[PDB]
Design a protein around this ligand. Structure first.
Ligand SMILES: [Zn+2]
Ligand SMILES: [Zn+2]
Lengths: 116, 163, 196, 56, 158, 233, 107
């Protein structure tokens, strides 16, 4: 959605329509600052969302002694050490697919063979 | 800023209906032209002297106002990093002079976008309507209500320059 | 250490998943009403909406969390400065001795000495209170977004066992308070009724 | 338990006792078996009180 | 607007603009380094608070100050009863012919006299003093100046 | 349980001061959008600041606790994923001891820090009472061989049931029970002995792992109704 | 030091014998905000000190990117003599230093 914030007061901008040009403008509700939008999308509802599948991956994820290790091959550096974990979305509708993080290039790949 | 600038301590209540320095100067000009038993026993609760001193000293926050009221910043006392800072002033010879720091104040601008009042705000918060109109501030700006100190002073100053 | 009393702060996500507007309201001690979180943030000195969101969400591209926060900033739009927000807090308080002008300070004191007391109770720590409040809101939103599961109440790591030490500690604290109260009452009675 | 790795779904991880009483339960099996036993003891107490009221 | 704001003026001056924020950190390649590490380790090691003190005296001796004790308190603290009870003196009723005149000069001084103030100035017993006061003055109880004697209008209106 | 203990709590101020000196940037200058990797530092549930290098801070904190500068009862947890560093000093937390496992590359695999030389002096002090220098449980604690761990810190550690088979890198008797190896090479601790999970009443049962669990519960209750010698006086 | 507010009566002309305006004259003065360790801040923030002596020297590489502080030999060889000034912020804006003292009250 790419929230936009005002330049002069840092408040949130809102979409407005200018019929003189039939375009989309983003204006502030208190200080009268306007800016033309770069994209025509203003709202998005994600009923089925995948944001958070790999949440929590950091530069030292391999230091975690509790994460299980695997021998799968990383298809970006050809290394065999890696830590894997299941999806981090706590909806009781997510698949049991695994996510692998390589301990040599920080690349994240998956075991999915259905859709990938 | 529009010089001169004043940095004093003052009450911040109703810091939208306080006379600007320029307005006061103009009013001074026209004024000159115009004239031309207790319970006998109570308990005090011990309070650390330092906090009471801090409470009394910081009761009236710093207010930084320019001449025309265009800039009005209110300072707030910060205690997280107040007494661990040190200042090095670069003299005009390459050298450094060290000065301990006393306090840190965080200043936030006031009255730049024509804020409402508490009574007006509460009427809108209550079910006057399902939700406040998106462009209410723009609408009320044209009616003339809810102006700023800067505009409230400029129109008065122009009301004098016109004569 | 110091007073042993407990004050609870609750941050509630009103509305269900089938609603068109779910706002967040926080319960403050001695206020009698659940205030929108934005109003509390402005009462702490953070007026810009962008800064408030920065205190809540720590990722600039987590639009899904920001989308759920937009109704909150919309609810408290009519208040746009520290003093008006404080007066909004104060008039909800249950004191009715504050008239209209001691009422801003009353809310300020409530936010200082009774709001999130376990961080501090001294003047000049609004930034810590705002950051912690954002931390609570962030965790609330993470669970509401099916990114975290509700905290397990039986997790033995969130429990404490009070032994004879703490048990006798609170008993002694209560009894010593009563003893001191009796001492002063005797002092007052001796001063007034003219005794030795 | 803090003896397996995160996201482990093998039978040994989620409470499958592979041994018999003759051979002896391992410490993980002993605790999981105890958890199941506690369920029965609680059920016995609660159902006894509730069925008694139903009978009356 | 508001005509009074109750400011507090002070002498202020901007005496510099911050250009760099610095963090002083001791160099690890310094000889005296690792003395700071020990100092920082002593910060957590320290036990500034001290334990309660146990009395090793005979228990009977320690309890000799408690309860019904043969010893008498020598304290002068909050002996309010002693302060005002000590002072006491009697006064004999003086002749009416003199006090009667004294009250009139007094009433000429002020047009309203309280009872406590009157007894203090006259320094006479309230018993006799009441007789003359009622004979000369009257007390208004229900008026705003309640419980205050004032000279009767017969002699005041002169 | 037999080896369970409850902390009495200490002052958190010394730890907060220690954190400030080692780069725990205060919370008054934290810009979340200019440091989207900083670890939030909590002490007794109070967000005191952030740290740019949590790994070194945790290493320094753990070493200090093990050598005996921070009280062993203090619990330190590093939620690497959540980017949080929680320190608990309050009283009322239940903890228990565990062996410490370190690499010790001399053999090339992780192994307990406690060796047979230590055990020799442990029993030497045990039997000299019935005079070598005293060597007690505290000596194990101060030498970094055992570690108090509470339920919250237990969430971030990997524990081996025995050092016999789990620690060594990796016919069978048909009568022995089937033991699962778990084939993990990242153990951080080891159980002193699994039997210590039981309490006072269940520690008198012989072969409680060859019984159905409710029978063990019944005996625990009934063993308190048995006549014996409650005291010698 | 309580005083009137708006002051349309022009009472500041006699109640105060000094200008009440903020002095924007020394603002163009470079200043470094330095955070000190506890052992160093406990002896540099002392008001029974700071007699104008040389606390040490500040050394900057000709090409920049590295600064170091060298204290004198007055520390009594109990603390390090060499420190590294770590620039947590090279460019700083909206931060200023302002003083505060009382005004002369008569005439
Ligand atoms: Zn704006
Ligand atoms: Zn790789």
């Amino acid at each position: 959605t790419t929230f936009r914030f005002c330049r002069d007061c840092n408040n949130m901008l809102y979409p407005r329509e200018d019929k003189e040009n039939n375009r989309l403008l983003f204006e502030c509700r208190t200080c009268s600052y306007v800016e033309e939008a770069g994209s025509p999308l203003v709202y998005r509802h994600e009923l089925i969302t995948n944001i958070g599948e790999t949440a929590g991956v950091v530069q030292d994820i391999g230091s975690d002694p509790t994460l299980p290790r695997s021998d799968r091959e990383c298809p970006k550096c050809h290394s065999r050490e890696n830590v894997f974990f299941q999806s981090q979305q706590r909806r009781k509708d997510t698949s049991m697919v695994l996510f692998f993080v390589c301990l040599s290039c920080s690349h994240i790949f998956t075991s999915d063979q259905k859709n990938k | 800023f529009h010089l001169p600038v004043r940095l004093h301590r003052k009450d911040t209540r109703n810091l939208q209906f306080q006379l600007t320095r320029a307005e006061i100067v103009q009013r001074q000009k026209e004024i000159s032209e115009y004239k031309k038993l207790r319970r006998k026993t109570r308990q005090l609760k011990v309070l650390d002297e330092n906090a009471k001193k801090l409470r009394f000293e910081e009761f009236y926050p710093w207010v930084m106002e320019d001449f025309d009221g265009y800039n009005t910043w209110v300072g707030s006392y910060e205690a997280g990093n107040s007494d661990s800072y040190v200042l090095l002033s670069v003299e005009d010879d390459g050298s450094f002079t060290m000065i301990p720091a006393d306090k840190v104040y965080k200043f936030t601008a006031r009255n730049k976008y024509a804020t409402l009042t508490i009574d007006e705000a509460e009427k809108r918060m209550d079910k006057k309507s399902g939700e406040v109109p998106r462009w209410l501030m723009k609408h009320l700006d044209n009616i003339g209500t809810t102006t700023t100190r800067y505009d409230r002073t400029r129109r008065k100053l122009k009301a004098v320059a016109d004569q | 250490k110091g007073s042993r009393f407990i004050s609870t702060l609750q941050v509630k996500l009103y509305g269900r998943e089938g609603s068109s507007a779910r706002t967040i309201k926080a319960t403050l001690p001695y206020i009698k009403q659940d205030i929108p979180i934005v109003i509390i943030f402005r009462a702490l000195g953070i007026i810009p909406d962008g800064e408030i969101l920065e205190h809540i969400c720590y990722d600039v591209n987590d639009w899904q969390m920001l989308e759920m926060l937009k109704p909150c900033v919309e609810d408290g739009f009519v208040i746009q400065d520290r003093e008006t927000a404080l007066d909004f807090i104060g008039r909800r308080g249950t004191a009715l001795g504050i008239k209209k002008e001691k009422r801003i300070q009353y809310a300020k004191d409530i936010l200082q000495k009774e709001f999130l007391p376990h961080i501090t109770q001294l003047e000049g720590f609004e930034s810590r209170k705002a950051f912690f409040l954002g931390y609570m809101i962030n965790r609330l939103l993470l669970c509401a977004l099916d990114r975290k599961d509700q905290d397990d109440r039986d997790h033995f790591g969130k429990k404490r066992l009070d032994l004879a030490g703490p048990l006798l500690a609170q008993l002694f604290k209560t009894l010593f308070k009563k003893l001191t109260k009796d001492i002063f009452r005797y002092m007052q009675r001796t001063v007034e009724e003219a005794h030795d | 338990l803090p003896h397996f790795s995160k996201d482990d779904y093998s039978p040994e991880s989620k409470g499958f006792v592979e041994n018999s009483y003759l051979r002896g339960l391992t410490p993980q099996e002993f605790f999981f078996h105890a958890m199941g036993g506690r369920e029965g003891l609680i059920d016995t107490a609660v159902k006894t009180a509730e069925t008694g009221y139903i009978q009356r | 607007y508001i005509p009074y704001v109750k400011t507090i003026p002070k002498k202020t001056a901007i005496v510099g603009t911050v250009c760099h924020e610095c963090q002083v950190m001791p160099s690890m390649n310094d000889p005296n380094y690792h003395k700071i590490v020990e100092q920082r380790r002593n910060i957590v090691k320290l036990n500034n608070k001290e334990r309660i003190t146990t009395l090793d005296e005979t228990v009977g001796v320690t309890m000799s100050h408690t309860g019904m004790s043969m010893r008498s308190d020598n304290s002068n603290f909050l002996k309010v009863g002693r302060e005002k009870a000590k002072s006491n003196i009697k006064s004999i009723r003086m002749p009416k012919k003199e006090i009667l005149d004294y009250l009139f000069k007094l009433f000429d001084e002020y047009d309203y006299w309280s009872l406590k103030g009157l007894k203090e100035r006259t320094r006479q017993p309230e018993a006799h003093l009441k007789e003359c006061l009622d004979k000369v003055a009257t007390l208004v109880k229900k008026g705003p100046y309640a419980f205050k004697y004032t000279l009767r209008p017969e002699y005041k209106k002169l | 349980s037999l080896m369970s203990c409850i902390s009495v709590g200490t002052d958190p101020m010394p730890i907060i001061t220690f954190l400030s000196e080692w780069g725990m940037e205060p919370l008054e200058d934290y810009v979340p959008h200019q440091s989207p990797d900083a670890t939030r530092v909590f002490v007794n549930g109070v967000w005191h600041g952030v740290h740019r290098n949590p790994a070194r801070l945790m290493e320094t904190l753990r070493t200090l606790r093990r050598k005996g500068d921070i009280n062993p009862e203090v619990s330190m947890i590093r939620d690497i994923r959540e980017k949080e560093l929680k320190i608990f000093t309050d009283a009322g937390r239940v903890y228990r001891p565990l062996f410490i496992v370190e690499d010790d590359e001399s053999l090339g695999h992780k192994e307990l820090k406690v060796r047979k030389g230590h055990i020799a002096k442990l029993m030497a002090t045990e039997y000299q009472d019935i005079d070598v220098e005293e060597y007690t449980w505290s000596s194990l604690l101060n030498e970094g061989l055992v570690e108090y761990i509470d339920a919250e810190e237990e969430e971030s550690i990997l524990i081996a049931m025995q050092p016999e088979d789990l620690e060594p890198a990796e016919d069978v008797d048909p009568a022995k029970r089937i033991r699962v190896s778990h084939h993990a090479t990242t153990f951080t601790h080891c159980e002193i002995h699994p039997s210590m999970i039981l309490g006072v009443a269940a520690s008198i049962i012989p072969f409680p792992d060859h019984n159905q669990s409710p029978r063990n519960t019944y005996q625990s209750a009934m063993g308190k109704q048995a006549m014996g010698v409650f005291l010698t006086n | 030091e309580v005083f009137d507010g708006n002051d349309i009566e022009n009472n500041e002309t006699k109640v105060y014998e000094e200008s009440l305006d903020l002095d924007l004259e020394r603002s163009n003065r470079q200043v470094w905000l330095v955070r000190l360790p506890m052992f160093l801040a406990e002896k540099w923030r002392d008001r029974n000190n700071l007699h104008g002596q040389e606390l040490g020297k500040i050394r900057i590489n000709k090409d920049g990117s590295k600064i170091t502080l060298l204290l004198n030999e007055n520390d009594n060889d109990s603390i390090p003599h060499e420190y590294d000034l770590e620039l947590t912020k090279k460019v700083v804006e909206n931060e200023y230093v302002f003083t505060e003292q009382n005004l002369k009250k008569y005439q």
